[PDB]
Amino acid sequence: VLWKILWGLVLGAVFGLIAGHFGYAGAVKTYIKPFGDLFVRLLKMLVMPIVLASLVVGAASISPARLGRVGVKIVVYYLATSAMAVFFGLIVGRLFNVGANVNLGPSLVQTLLNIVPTNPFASLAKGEVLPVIFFAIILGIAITYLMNRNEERVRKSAETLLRVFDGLAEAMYLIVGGVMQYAPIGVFALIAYVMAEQGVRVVGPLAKVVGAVYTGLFLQIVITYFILLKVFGIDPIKFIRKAKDAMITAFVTRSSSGTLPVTMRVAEEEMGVDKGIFSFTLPLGATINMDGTALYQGVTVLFVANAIGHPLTLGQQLVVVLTAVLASIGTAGVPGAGAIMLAMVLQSVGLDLTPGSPVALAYAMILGIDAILDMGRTMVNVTGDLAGTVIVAKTEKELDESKWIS
Amino acid sequence: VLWKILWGLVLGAVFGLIAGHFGYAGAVKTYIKPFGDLFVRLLKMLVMPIVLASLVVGAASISPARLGRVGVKIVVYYLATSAMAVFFGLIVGRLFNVGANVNLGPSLVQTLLNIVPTNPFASLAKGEVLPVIFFAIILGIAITYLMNRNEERVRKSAETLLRVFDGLAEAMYLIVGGVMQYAPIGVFALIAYVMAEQGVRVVGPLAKVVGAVYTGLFLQIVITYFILLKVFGIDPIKFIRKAKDAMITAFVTRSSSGTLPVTMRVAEEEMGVDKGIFSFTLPLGATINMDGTALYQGVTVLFVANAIGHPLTLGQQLVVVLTAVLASIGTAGVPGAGAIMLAMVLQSVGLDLTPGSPVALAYAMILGIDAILDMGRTMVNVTGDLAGTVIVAKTEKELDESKWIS
Amino acid sequence: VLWKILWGLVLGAVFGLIAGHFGYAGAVKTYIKPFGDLFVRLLKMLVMPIVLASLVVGAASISPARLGRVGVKIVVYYLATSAMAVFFGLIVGRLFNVGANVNLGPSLVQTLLNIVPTNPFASLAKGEVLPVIFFAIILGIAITYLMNRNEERVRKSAETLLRVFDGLAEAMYLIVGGVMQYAPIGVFALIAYVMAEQGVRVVGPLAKVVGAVYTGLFLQIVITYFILLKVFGIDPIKFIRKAKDAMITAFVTRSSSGTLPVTMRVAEEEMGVDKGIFSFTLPLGATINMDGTALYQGVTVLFVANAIGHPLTLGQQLVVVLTAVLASIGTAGVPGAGAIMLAMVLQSVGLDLTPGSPVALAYAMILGIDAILDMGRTMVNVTGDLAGTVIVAKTEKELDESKWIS
Numbered sequence A, B, C: 001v002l003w004k005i006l007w008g009l010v011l012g013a014v015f016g017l018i019a020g021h022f023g024y025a026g027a028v029k030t031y032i033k034p035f036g037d038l039f040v041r042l043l044k045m046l047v048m049p050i051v052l053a054s055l056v057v058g059a060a061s062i063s064p065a066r067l068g069r070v071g072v073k074i075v076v077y078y079l080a081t082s083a084m085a086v087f088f089g090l091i092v093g094r095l096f097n098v099g100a101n102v103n104l105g106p107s108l109v110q111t112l113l114n115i116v117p118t119n120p121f122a123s124l125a126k127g128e129v130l131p132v133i134f135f136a137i138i139l140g141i142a143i144t145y146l147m148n149r150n151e152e153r154v155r156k157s158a159e160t161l162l163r164v165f166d167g168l169a170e171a172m173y174l175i176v177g178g179v180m181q182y183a184p185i186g187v188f189a190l191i192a193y194v195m196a197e198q199g200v201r202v203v204g205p206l207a208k209v210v211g212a213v214y215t216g217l218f219l220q221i222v223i224t225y226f227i228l229l230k231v232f233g234i235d236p237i238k239f240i241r242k243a244k245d246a247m248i249t250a251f252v253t254r255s256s257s258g259t260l261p262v263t264m265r266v267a268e269e270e271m272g273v274d275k276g277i278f279s280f281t282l283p284l285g286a287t288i289n290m291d292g293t294a295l296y297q298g299v300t301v302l303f304v305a306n307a308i309g310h311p312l313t314l315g316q317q318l319v320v321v322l323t324a325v326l327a328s329i330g331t332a333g334v335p336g337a338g339a340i341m342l343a344m345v346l347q348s349v350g351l352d353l354t355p356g357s358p359v360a361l362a363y364a365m366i367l368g369i370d371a372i373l374d375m376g377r378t379m380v381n382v383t384g385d386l387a388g389t390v391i392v393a394k395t396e397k398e399l400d401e402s403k404w405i406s
C-alpha cells in the first residue's frame, strides 16, 4: 500500500499531459475528472467533524498555559516562513526574468472580531474553521475546568460531552484511513484533469513562470523547512517520507482545509504529534499560512509588471507584495484564490482592467495556468504547516521520537 | 384510537367539498387550514433528528456486507416498481382518453457527486436527506469498527456517541407517537382545505383526468405491490391495515420526507422491521421512488398532448416519460413538483409557453388540480416505500413475523 | 470584583460624552469601540448552546403540568407589564410635551405556526430562539418519559443525551463567568462609543424626549416591578442588587438575546432560580417582552405627531400604540428595532415619507438618538424578564430564599 499515492500522481500527470497534447482533454473532463472530485468531497466531508472533535479533545488534554505557548510558537513560525517566502518570491522571479514578451503597457480589526463566532452552530454549518477552532478551544478548556470540580454530576456531564467529541474524532480518523485506501485513484484523476487542461499551456514565457514559481516553492521547502527542522533536531528526509501523503494530497486538492483530515492523520500516525498540539496548530495554519501567497504574488506580479513594461523597483515590489499579504491573511486555502487577489492588487493601484487592455491580457495569461500554480502553492503550504507543527510539538515535548528512527 | 385517522380523512374531504361548493373555501383558508399546517410542521420537525439518529444506529447495528445487500435489493425494487408505474401511466391515460376538449394546437454525474456531503453539519442544517444518509451510514460503520477495537477508551467513546444518537432517535419516535395522538385533526384540516379549494374543480374532462390518474395509482397498489408481497409471502391485507397511518399521512401531507417519522414509526411498531433495514431504506426511498412521477407525467402529458391536438405515438410518449423520469430522480417528495417538471418537459421540446398559447392554457388547467394529483402521488409513493422495505427486510430475515398474524 | 461593572458604565459614559463634545468621537469609533464589540460577540457565542442545553435540562427536570403552569404564569406577567408600559408611555410623553418645535406638518397566524421549527438543526444554525425553545422542551419531556420507561437501554440512551446537554450548559455557564471577569472593559467601551456619537445630540427638544423616555422606563421599574415583587414577598432592593450585572449588560449590549447567558447566570448564581423555571421563562421573555416597545412607540409617536402638528387624541394614540405592539410581538431584542417599527407605523397610516417631507425629518431626528433610546429599552426589558422569572419561580416554590437575605 505504501508509496501508491506517488505512483498515482506521476501516472496521472503523464496521462493528463498526453491526453491534452492530443486534443482529448474534453473527454477527460467528462470521464476522468469525477473520480478526483469524489476524492475531494470525501475528504471535505470530514473537515468539520474531525476539526471540532479533535480540537475539543486536544484543548481538554492540555493546560491553558501550554495552549497559549503553542499558539505563540506556531505564529512566530508562520511569520518567519512567510518572510522567507517573500524573499524567495522576489529572488526567483527576478532570476528567471519572467515576462520577456512585449505589449503596449485597513479592515483587519473586523477580521479579528470575526474570529469569535456569534453562533457556533452557524459557524459549523457554514464551515468557518477559525471560529470553530475558537469554540472548540474554549469548550475544551471549560470541560477540563469542570472535570476538576468536586461535584461528581458536573464531572460526569463534562466527561460524557468530551467522550462524544472523542468518539466523533476517532470515527473521522478511521474514515480518513479508509478513504486513504482510495487516495491513489483520486490523485490520479485530479492531476490528470489539470495536466490535460492547463499543462499543455506551460510553454514559452509561461513555462519560465511556472518553473520560476515552482523553483521558489522548492527553495522554501529545501531551505527554510529543512534548516528549521535540523536546528531543532528533526531528520528532514524522514520528515518528508512521513509527510508524503499530506504533501501529495495538498498538491492535487489545492485546498489546505480539504487536506486537513489527511494532514491530521499523518500527524498522528506518522509524525507522532499529540492531539493537543496538532488539533490546534494544523487547522490554524491551514488558514493563516502565507508562504504560497507571498510566492505567488511575488512571481506573478513581476511577470505582469514586465509584460506591460511598467518599471518596478525591488522595494516597490516588496511593498506591493506585503500589502497583498496583509490583505490575504485569514483566508484559508481555496482554488482560484491568488488570481482573485492579484486582480484586486492590480485594481487598487489604478491600472485599467477594461477588456482589451494590456493588463487584462497578462492577467488572463496567468489565470490560464493558475491551477498549475495553485497545486504547488497548496503543497508548499501544507508542507510548512506540518513542519511547524512538528517543531512546536518538539519544543513542547509533545513529539514521539520513536516514529523518527529506522 | 385505532382507525381515527381514516375518519378524519373522510370527514375532512366531505366538509371540504361542501364548503367549496357553497363558496366558503376562502373562510376555510383562514380558519381551517392552519391546523393541518401545524400537523405538517410538527412532523417536519422530526425528520432530520429521527433520520440521522435512526440511520447511525441502524448502520451500527448491521454489517457493511448486509447493508450493501439491502441497498442493492431496495434499488432493484424501486426500478421494478417505476417500470410498472410507467406502464400503468400510459395504459390508463389512453383508456380514459383524457383531453377531449379542443384548442388551436445529461447532468446526473454531479447529482451523484452531490450524494457525498462536503459539510455534514451544513447538510443537517439545510435538511438534505441523501447526504445525511451517507454520513450516518459511514458514521455507524466507523462506530462499529471502533467498538470492536481492543482499546477500551475507543470503545467507550464510540458507545457514548452511539448512545447519544440512540437517545435522540428514541425521543423522536416517542414524539411521533404523541403527534399521532393529534393526527386525525391535522388530516381533517388538510384534506378539507384541498377539497374546498380544488375538489370543486374536478369535473368534466378534468374529472376524467383525476379519475384516470387515481386509477393508475390504484392499479400500482393493488397489482404491483400486492403481487410482490404475495410472491415473498406477506399478507397484503394485513400490510395495508398496518400501513394505513403512513398511507393517509402521505396522502394529506403531500411529502414523502414529511411523512418519514410516521412511516418509520409504522415500520417499527406495526410492520416489525429492524432499524438496520428501514432506517436506511425508507429515507432513501423517500428521495428515489419514481412511481408517482411516472404516473403523473404519463397521464398529464397525454392530457396536454390531446388538448393541443399534437400527435403522440405510444413510443414517443414512452421516451418522453422516461426522459422526464431521468430528470426527476433524486428529488424528494415536495408539493408542486410534478407541475414544475411537466413545465420543464414542455419547454425542452420547443413548445410556446408564452401567455395566451394553447399549451400555457392546458398547463394552467393541470396546475389547478395539481394538489389533487399530488395527494395520490405521495400516497402511492409512501405505500411503495413501505412495501419494498418490508420485502427487503424479509429477504434479509430482519422482519418480525408475529406482527403479521391475527 | 463585585460592583466593577457599574464603575465601567459610569466611567465609559463620562469618557464618551467628553470625547464626543470635543470632536474626537471618530477616533473613538476606530480605537475604543472594538473592545465592546468583542464583549458583545463573546456573549452572543453562548446564546444557542446555553439556551438549548439549559432548556433541555430544565424541561427534563420538570413535569409537563408544571411547565404548562410556568408558561401561563409568565405570559400573564408579560401582558400585565406591557399594559403598564403603554400607560406610562402615554402619560410621560404627554407630561414632557415632547416636540414643541415647528414644521410644515393580520399576519399573526403564520407567526404562531412558525413557532414550530421545521428543521431544528436549521433553527440552531440560524439562531432562532423560539423554535429552539420548542424543540428543547419537547426533547426534555420526551427524555424524561423515556427515563421512566422500564427498559434499561432506553433509560441509558436518554441519560447519555441529557448528560451531553447538561455538560454543554455547564461549560457555557463557566465561560459566562470567565467573560464576566472581562465585562467592565466591554461595558466601558460600548457606553463610551454610544455617548461619543449620540450623547452630544441629546439637547433641546430631544433632551426632553430622552428624559421623557427614560422617565417612563424608570417608572416601569420602580412601580410595576417593585410593586409586583413586594406583593409576592421579594425584597426589591435585594432584587436590584442581584440583577445589576444583567441590567447593565442589557443596557450596553442593546440585545435581550445577547444578554441571555448573563441573565441566566445571574438567575442561577444570584437569584437562585431553578433551571426548570429560568431556562424556559428567560429565553421566552427575551422574545415576547413588549414593555420597551410600548414605551418607545408611545413617546416617539407623540414627539413625531407634535412635530408635524397632526392632532392626536389619547384614544387614537392608544390604538396606534396597540397596533404597533401587536405588529412587534415575537421579535427579540435587536438594535435599531423600534426605529424600523416606527417607520412602518408612519407608512401604514398614509403619511408621506418622501425626502424633504416633515415626517421624514422628525423620523431622522429620532433615528439619531435611537441608540440612546435603545439602551434604556433593553435594560428595562431584561429587568422585567428577571422580575417575572423570579416571581413565577416563587409561585412554583422553585425560588431559593437563602439568596435573598443579608
Ligand SMILES: CCCCCCCC/C=C/CCCCCCCC(=O)OC[C@H](O)CO
Pocket (backbone or CB within 6 Å): A063, A064, A065, A066, A067, A068, A069, A070, A071, A072, A075, A137
Ligand atoms: C494565534 C496566536 C495565539 C492565540 C492565543 C494562544 C492560542 C489559543 C489560546 C490558548 C490559551 C490562551 C489563554 C490561556 C493561557 C494563558 C495563561 C493561563 O493559564 O491563564 C491565563 C489567565 O488569564 C491568568 O493566568
Ligand SMILES: CCCCCCCC/C=C/CCCCCCCC(=O)OC[C@H](O)CO
Pocket (backbone or CB within 6 Å): B063, B064, B065, B066, B067, B068, B069, B070, B071, B072, B075, B137
Ligand atoms: C443505493 C444503492 C446501494 C448503495 C450501496 C449500498 C447501500 C449503502 C452502503 C452499504 C455498504 C456498502 C459497502 C460495504 C459493504 C461491501 C462489502 C464489505 O463488507 O466490505 C467491502 C470492502 O471494500 C471489501 O470487503
Ligand SMILES: CCCCCCCC/C=C/CCCCCCCC(=O)OC[C@H](O)CO
Pocket (backbone or CB within 6 Å): C063, C064, C065, C066, C067, C068, C069, C070, C071, C072, C075, C137
Ligand atoms: C407561552 C405560553 C405557554 C405555552 C404552553 C406552556 C409552556 C410550554 C409547554 C409546557 C407543557 C404544556 C403541555 C403539557 C402540560 C399539560 C398537562 C399535562 O401534564 O399533560 C397534558 C396532556 O395532554 C393531558 O394530561
